[PDB]
Design a protein around this ligand. Structure first.
Ligand SMILES: Cc1cc(-c2ccc3nc(C4CCOCC4)n(CCOC(F)(F)F)c3c2)cn(C)c1=O
Length: 117
């Protein structure tokens, strides 16, 4: 049945899944803040990645009630992953670290989504 989710319900359910990503070391570090192409020396980045996303931005959106439904949060986490797999070479640390975060996220999000429905 279709359903209305309160901002605090989503925060309580979903913030632990986000913290599970932030706990990963070494893999979470490049995902903690928005990519800064100038600092990183990669001026092509915003030419390739049209809709940047990162953990800090997702955390803020959860804290400020910007998700109405859990799939919107899942979509942002996957936008972050897809951006990293699009831009980075397959041998790079960021690409392989992304793959690890996707494994962790898949494990954490499943029982939480069952709980929200
Ligand atoms: C999603 C994404 C993220 C990055 C990205 C973001 C932050 C990074 N900080 C570092 C270093 C730099 C100097 O010392 C501290 C770590 N790197 C370099 C890689 O280091 C690491 F592998 F350990 F993370 C950063 C990279 C870059 N692109 C292109 C992204 O797509």
């Amino acid at each position: 049945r279709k359903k209305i989710f309160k901002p605090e319900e989503l925060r309580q359910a979903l913030m632990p899944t986000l913290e599970a990503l932030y706990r990963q070391d070494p893999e979470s570090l490049p995902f903690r803040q928005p990519v800064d192409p100038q600092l990183l020396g990669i001026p092509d980045y915003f030419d390739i990645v049209k809709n940047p996303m990162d953990l800090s931005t997702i955390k803020r959106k959860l804290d400020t009630g910007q998700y109405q439904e859990p799939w919107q949060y899942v979509d942002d986490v996957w936008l972050m992953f897809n951006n990293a797999w699009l831009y980075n070479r397959k041998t790079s640390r960021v690409y392989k670290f992304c793959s690890k975060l996707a494994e962790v996220f898949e494990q954490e999000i499943d029982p939480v989504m069952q709980s929200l429905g």
